[PDB]
Amino acid sequence: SNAFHQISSRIQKSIDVDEVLRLCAEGLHDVLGYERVNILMADTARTSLSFVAAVGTADFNPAGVVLPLDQRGGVITKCFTDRQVYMIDDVSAYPTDFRLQSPYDAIRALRSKSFVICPIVVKGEAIGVFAVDNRSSNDTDVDTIKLFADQASSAIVRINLL
Amino acid sequence: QISSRIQKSIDVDEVLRLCAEGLHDVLGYERVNILMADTARTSLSFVAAVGTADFNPAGVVLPLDQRGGVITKCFTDRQVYMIDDVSAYPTDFRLQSPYDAIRALRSKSFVICPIVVKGEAIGVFAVDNRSSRRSLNDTDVDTIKLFADQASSAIVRINLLKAI
């Protein structure tokens, strides 16, 4: 009802990218009910990731969290590189290059064993990711998240034009 | 009528052929390629190829290493790779020899979808509509995943059945 439209209206009106991304994550948490919604954005040189939203994780302020965008990123780095969506059941059942290494693995927001990574793609390049999980608990979930990443992406192009 | 016919078979390759038939003949996907890992899981044998003229996949066996580019990555990571144009992806996505000697595998645009049994890939669907300019999308991926799911269920049924 009322909830999805307010979220939608406030993104279209937004003129700050970090705010659009925070609203995307709030949308997905409050309106669609996913427990944890993280958004990570690459820096211009594409060698670091900063956290912009970590909805559903408490006692965590991401400010000044930079994460190396290399092999220590595990499946998150693979997403930036290949722009695929990863649906992970139990990340230990996967190749060695999936596991988040340190510093990623000392961050409660990132410590789930099952989850979805969805790239935010502008100009043929993943410029960030949504990482979503239900720690306390499919393709229609993916598609729904992709929608929000699509909207994030269009809002980034649009805000940047302004 | 092919969910019914899969059901009736106790020959894995036949079930794979019928899956590829259904996707192609009924749903209109132009090229449907199905490859199964050998027992050591270091090669793929080419089991079904629908839509590629003048080609019988029997006897074709391909290395599961880097030469298989994104097919090997699909198999290793158990991830759907939806590749709208291969030239927009890193170099290690491209097929190398011997994979690139096969017409059935030469699309520049495709989806590769793992066939997964109990958390392990045992083969792949590689699907393309290369003569159409329309890119495959998320609903095409749902449809291909559905047939991979049927192949995987039926492989399990057949294996549980023939186990001595």
Burial pattern A129-157, b for ≥16 Cβ within 10 A else e, equals bbbbbeeeeeeeebebbbebbebbbebbe
Q: How many CB atoms lie within 10 A of CB A162?
A: 5
CA distances from B6 to A76, B13, B16, B32, B162 (A): 38, 11, 9, 17, 16
A99 in reach of chain B (CB within 8 A): no
Task: List Cβ neighbours of A81 (8 Å cut-off, separation of 6 or more).
Answer: A126, B90
Contact between B136 and B111 (Cβ < 8 Å):
yes
Rg (CA), chain B: 15
A114 in reach of chain B (CB within 8 A): no
Cβ <8 Å between B119 and A93: yes
Owning domain of residue B35 = 1-164
Looking at beta carbons, which residues of chain A come within 8 Å of B142? 139
Q: From the candidates B71, B77, B143, which should be mutated to test the interface with A, based on the most A CB atoms within 10 A?
A: B77
Q: How far is B54 from chain A (nearest CA, A)?
A: 33
Q: How far is B93 from chain A (nearest CA, A)?
A: 9
Resolution (A): 2.2
B41 in reach of chain A (CB within 8 A): no
Q: How far is A5 from chain B (nearest CA, A)?
A: 25
- Comparing CA positions, the residue from A34, A89, B17, B100 lying closest to residue A24 is A34
**DSSP, res A13:** H
How many distinct structural domains can be found in chain B? 1
Distance CA B93, CA B143 (A): 23
Nearest to A143 among B77, B93, B138 (CB): B138
Nearest to A84 among B79, B119, B142 (CB): B79
State the method.
X-ray
A155 Rama class: left (phi>0) / alpha (psi -120 to 50) / beta: alpha
The packing angle between helices B138-162 and B12-21, to 10°, is 160
- Pairing assessment for the beta strands B61-63 and B43-50 based on DSSP bridges: antiparallel
Cβ <8 Å between B82 and A86: no
The token duo for A43 is 């820096």
A139 in reach of chain B (CB within 8 A): yes
- Comparing CA positions, the residue from A25, A39, A118 lying closest to residue A80 is A118
What CATH number corresponds to the domain at position B73? 3.30.450.40
Q: Is the dihedral of CA B161, B119, B48, B68 positive or negative?
A: negative
